Amino acid sequence: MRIPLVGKDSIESKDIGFTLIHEHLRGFSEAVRQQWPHLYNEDEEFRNAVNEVKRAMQFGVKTIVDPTVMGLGRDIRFMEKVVKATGINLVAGTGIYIYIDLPFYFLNRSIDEIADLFIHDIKEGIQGTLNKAGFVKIAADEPGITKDVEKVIKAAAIANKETKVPIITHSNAHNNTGLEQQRILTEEGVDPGKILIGHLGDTDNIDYIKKIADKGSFIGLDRYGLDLFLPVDKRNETTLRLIKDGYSDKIMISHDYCCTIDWGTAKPEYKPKLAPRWSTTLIFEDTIPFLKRNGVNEEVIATIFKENPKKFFS
Amino acid sequence: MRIPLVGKDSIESKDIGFTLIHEHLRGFSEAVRQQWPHLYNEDEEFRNAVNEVKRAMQFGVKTIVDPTVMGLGRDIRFMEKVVKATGINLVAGTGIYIYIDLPFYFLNRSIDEIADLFIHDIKEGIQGTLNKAGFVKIAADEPGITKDVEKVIKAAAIANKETKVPIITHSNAHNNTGLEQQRILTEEGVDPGKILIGHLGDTDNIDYIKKIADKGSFIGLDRYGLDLFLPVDKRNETTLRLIKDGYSDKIMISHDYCCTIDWGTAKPEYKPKLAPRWSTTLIFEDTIPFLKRNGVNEEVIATIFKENPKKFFS
Ligand SMILES: [Co+2]
Ligand SMILES: [Co+2]
Ligand SMILES: [Fe+3]
Ligand SMILES: [Fe+3]
C-alpha cells in the first residue's frame, strides 16, 4: 500500500494502471482568490474538473497525478469532491511552486523547517485531512536557481530521503534549470530514478532532453496542447524520435492541462493548421494515434503510461 | 458619512477622533496559511487582537486604520469579529502589498484591471461582504520601483481619482522609494495631501523626511517599537525635532504593531537599555510622555492623532 490516494485507501504501486502524471484539476493564486473571491466560480471549476476526469476515464485512465501545490492553489477538499464524483485514483502532492523568492513567512526559516512542512503532508495529511501527499513538487523557471529556489530543492531532497516519495519538477526547457534540479537533487542523495524533470517537451533540443534522461531521470513530455511552448506536431516529432532512439523507459507524457486556471494567459496566435484542443485527453485524439501509425507498438504505450509511473512510485 | 467602518455604519471624517493610522489586527502569507493551516491558531490570534484593541481604547483610541491587504492576509470576517468584541471604529483598506512581482494571476492583465479590484472593494465591498474599503495600500521596498510595483501604484491612483479614498504606502526609508511613490502618484493626479508615505520613522535622515512632507504628503513615523528599524529613543529624537521645526501638520504616528504575524522575524539584539514593549500602546507609555516632558503641548498631540487623520480622510 505504497501510494496514498485522495478520498481512498492507498494502493500498491503495481496497481496504479494507466496514469496521467501531470494534470491539474484546478489552479489559482491563493492570495488573489482569498482577496477577490468575486473573480471565481467554484461550481463551474468543479463541473469542468469532473467532466475532464470523466473523459480521461473513458479513454482508460486509471490514475491522475496532480502536482498542484503551494503557489498554485492546492485544495484537498476540492480534490476529494472530484474523486467522489468520478471514482478516479488521484495522487496529491506537497511542495512549493516559486520562481524567485519564498513568501514572507519563510524569512529567517531553515531548509529543515521547509522540509518539515512537506513531511507533515506526507506522514500526517494535507490541510487538516487524512489525505496524504504522494510526491513533492518543486519549480524553477526563467530566473534560474535562486537562493530560495535552491532551499526548496534541498527541502524536497530531505523529504524524499525520509519518506521515499518521488519528486516532480517544473523547469524551463530552454535554460538548463531542469539539468540543475537533477544535479542538485542527486548531490543531496536522491535516486535519479525518483525524479521527473518537467516540461522538457517544450523544446525540440533532443540532446538536452537525452542528457537528462541519460543521467537517470524521467523526462516530462508533459504539456501536450500548449502550442505556445511547442506545437503538437513538433512535440510529436520529438516524442517519436526519442522512442525510436530507445528512450521509452524514461519518457513520461501528459498535458499539464488545467481544467481551470486563473492566469491572464491572453495572447492568441493562429497557425495554418487548426489549433488542437488542449485538454486532458488530447493525447488520445492526436499523439497516441500519431505514434501508432508511425509504427510505435502497444508495448511502448504501456511502458510510458503504466510501467514508468509504476517505477516512479515504487 | 465619508469613511466606511468594518461592522458599522459609515462615519463623517470629522468624527474619526483619536486615530492609530497604521496597525494590523493580524498578518499572514495567504498561500502558507491555506496550505499549512496546522501552523496557525485563529482563536489565539483573535484573543490577541481583541486584547490589543481593548488596551488601545483604554488610552482613548477611537479609530484604528488597518492596512492589511493582499499579500498580508486581509480577512474582513476576522476584522468584523474583532469589532463586535470591542466596539472599535476599524477602517479596512484594499490594495496589493508586493516588493517585486505580482501573483501569476496578473500575467497579461492591465493596470485598469488591477484598479477595478480596488474599486470593487471600495464601492461594492470586501470579500463578499458589505464592509467597504476606505483607502488603498501600496508597497515598495529594497527592490525599488519594479514594473509590477509601478502598475500597483498607478492602479491606486485610478482608484483614488474615482473614489477619493486616500493612499497609504509602505516604503523603505533608506532608498528613495517613498519619494518615488509620492512623485508617481502626484504625476497621475493624486492630491499630495491624500498620501501617507510609510515607514519614514525608520530613518533619522531628517532632510529626506522633510523633503517628502514639504512636497505635501503625510509622513509615517509609524513603526514605534520596532527597534530593528530604528530604536525608540532615536525615533523620539527625530519626532521631537520635526515637531519643533513645525512639521506637526504632516506627522502621523503609529506602531505598525501586528498582534500576530507569521514572518520568521527571529534574530534578537540586546542593547544596554531594556527593550521597549512593541505593542499598539507603546506610544502612550513612551513616546507621548517623552514629548510632553519636552514641552510638546496637547495641541500638537491633537494635531497628529486627530486633525491629521481627519484631513487625510476628508
Ligand atoms: Co509546471
Ligand atoms: Co509596511
Ligand atoms: Fe503543471
Ligand atoms: Fe504595516
mmCIF file of N, CA, C and O and ligand atoms in Angstrom, chain A residues 22 24 67 72 97 99 137-141 168-171 198-199 202 222-223 256 263, ligand 1:
data_model
loop_
_atom_site.group_PDB
_atom_site.id
_atom_site.type_symbol
_atom_site.label_atom_id
_atom_site.label_comp_id
_atom_site.label_asym_id
_atom_site.label_seq_id
_atom_site.Cartn_x
_atom_site.Cartn_y
_atom_site.Cartn_z
ATOM 1 N N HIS A 22 0.862 14.382 -14.949
ATOM 2 C CA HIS A 22 0.919 15.815 -14.682
ATOM 3 C C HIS A 22 -0.312 16.509 -15.263
ATOM 4 O O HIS A 22 -0.301 16.962 -16.406
ATOM 5 N N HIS A 24 -3.828 19.140 -13.777
ATOM 6 C CA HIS A 24 -4.321 19.975 -12.691
ATOM 7 C C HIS A 24 -5.841 20.035 -12.734
ATOM 8 O O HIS A 24 -6.423 20.510 -13.709
ATOM 9 N N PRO A 67 0.014 17.780 -9.578
ATOM 10 C CA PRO A 67 1.066 18.482 -8.838
ATOM 11 C C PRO A 67 0.736 19.932 -8.500
ATOM 12 O O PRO A 67 1.620 20.790 -8.493
ATOM 13 N N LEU A 72 -0.011 27.383 -6.423
ATOM 14 C CA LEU A 72 -0.944 27.030 -7.486
ATOM 15 C C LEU A 72 -2.343 26.733 -6.952
ATOM 16 O O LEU A 72 -3.215 26.356 -7.731
ATOM 17 N N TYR A 97 5.754 25.905 -5.198
ATOM 18 C CA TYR A 97 5.946 26.373 -6.561
ATOM 19 C C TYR A 97 6.277 27.861 -6.506
ATOM 20 O O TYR A 97 5.393 28.688 -6.292
ATOM 21 N N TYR A 99 9.258 30.839 -8.421
ATOM 22 C CA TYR A 99 10.293 31.098 -9.411
ATOM 23 C C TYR A 99 11.443 31.919 -8.832
ATOM 24 O O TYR A 99 12.560 31.818 -9.333
ATOM 25 N N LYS A 137 6.554 18.375 -5.273
ATOM 26 C CA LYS A 137 6.625 19.231 -6.475
ATOM 27 C C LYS A 137 7.483 20.456 -6.168
ATOM 28 O O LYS A 137 7.218 21.142 -5.175
ATOM 29 N N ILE A 138 8.484 20.717 -7.060
ATOM 30 C CA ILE A 138 9.357 21.915 -6.950
ATOM 31 C C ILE A 138 9.401 22.574 -8.325
ATOM 32 O O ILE A 138 9.053 21.943 -9.325
ATOM 33 N N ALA A 139 9.842 23.835 -8.374
ATOM 34 C CA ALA A 139 9.859 24.589 -9.620
ATOM 35 C C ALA A 139 11.111 25.458 -9.728
ATOM 36 O O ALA A 139 11.694 25.880 -8.731
ATOM 37 N N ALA A 140 11.484 25.725 -10.981
ATOM 38 C CA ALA A 140 12.421 26.773 -11.353
ATOM 39 C C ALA A 140 12.063 27.181 -12.774
ATOM 40 O O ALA A 140 11.568 26.356 -13.538
ATOM 41 N N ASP A 141 12.300 28.446 -13.125
ATOM 42 C CA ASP A 141 11.947 28.900 -14.459
ATOM 43 C C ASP A 141 13.002 29.887 -14.949
ATOM 44 O O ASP A 141 14.192 29.686 -14.709
ATOM 45 N N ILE A 168 8.538 15.540 -8.518
ATOM 46 C CA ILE A 168 8.164 16.070 -9.821
ATOM 47 C C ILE A 168 8.634 17.518 -9.886
ATOM 48 O O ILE A 168 8.428 18.285 -8.942
ATOM 49 N N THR A 169 9.275 17.901 -10.996
ATOM 50 C CA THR A 169 9.708 19.284 -11.126
ATOM 51 C C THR A 169 8.966 20.001 -12.247
ATOM 52 O O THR A 169 8.446 19.394 -13.187
ATOM 53 N N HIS A 170 8.919 21.321 -12.089
ATOM 54 C CA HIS A 170 8.651 22.264 -13.156
ATOM 55 C C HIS A 170 9.990 22.885 -13.527
ATOM 56 O O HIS A 170 10.720 23.314 -12.640
ATOM 57 N N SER A 171 10.309 22.915 -14.824
ATOM 58 C CA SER A 171 11.519 23.580 -15.286
ATOM 59 C C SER A 171 11.199 24.388 -16.535
ATOM 60 O O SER A 171 10.122 24.266 -17.113
ATOM 61 N N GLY A 198 10.461 18.229 -15.352
ATOM 62 C CA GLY A 198 9.255 18.640 -16.043
ATOM 63 C C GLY A 198 9.515 19.582 -17.216
ATOM 64 O O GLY A 198 10.505 20.321 -17.248
ATOM 65 N N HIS A 199 8.606 19.505 -18.191
ATOM 66 C CA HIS A 199 8.420 20.490 -19.244
ATOM 67 C C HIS A 199 9.516 20.404 -20.299
ATOM 68 O O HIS A 199 9.704 21.338 -21.075
ATOM 69 N N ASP A 202 8.806 20.966 -24.023
ATOM 70 C CA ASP A 202 8.673 22.328 -24.522
ATOM 71 C C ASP A 202 9.802 22.677 -25.492
ATOM 72 O O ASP A 202 9.756 23.731 -26.127
ATOM 73 N N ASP A 222 5.242 16.792 -21.260
ATOM 74 C CA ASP A 222 4.128 16.831 -20.325
ATOM 75 C C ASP A 222 3.210 18.030 -20.545
ATOM 76 O O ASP A 222 2.363 18.304 -19.692
ATOM 77 N N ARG A 223 3.327 18.713 -21.690
ATOM 78 C CA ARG A 223 2.498 19.880 -21.955
ATOM 79 C C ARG A 223 1.825 19.794 -23.322
ATOM 80 O O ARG A 223 1.644 20.808 -23.997
ATOM 81 N N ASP A 256 -0.492 18.668 -18.762
ATOM 82 C CA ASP A 256 -0.394 19.815 -17.872
ATOM 83 C C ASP A 256 -1.663 20.641 -18.013
ATOM 84 O O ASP A 256 -1.657 21.860 -17.844
ATOM 85 N N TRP A 263 -4.648 32.436 -14.400
ATOM 86 C CA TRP A 263 -3.637 33.277 -15.025
ATOM 87 C C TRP A 263 -4.243 34.017 -16.218
ATOM 88 O O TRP A 263 -5.138 33.503 -16.888
HETATM 89 CO CO CO C 1 4.814 23.493 -14.467
#
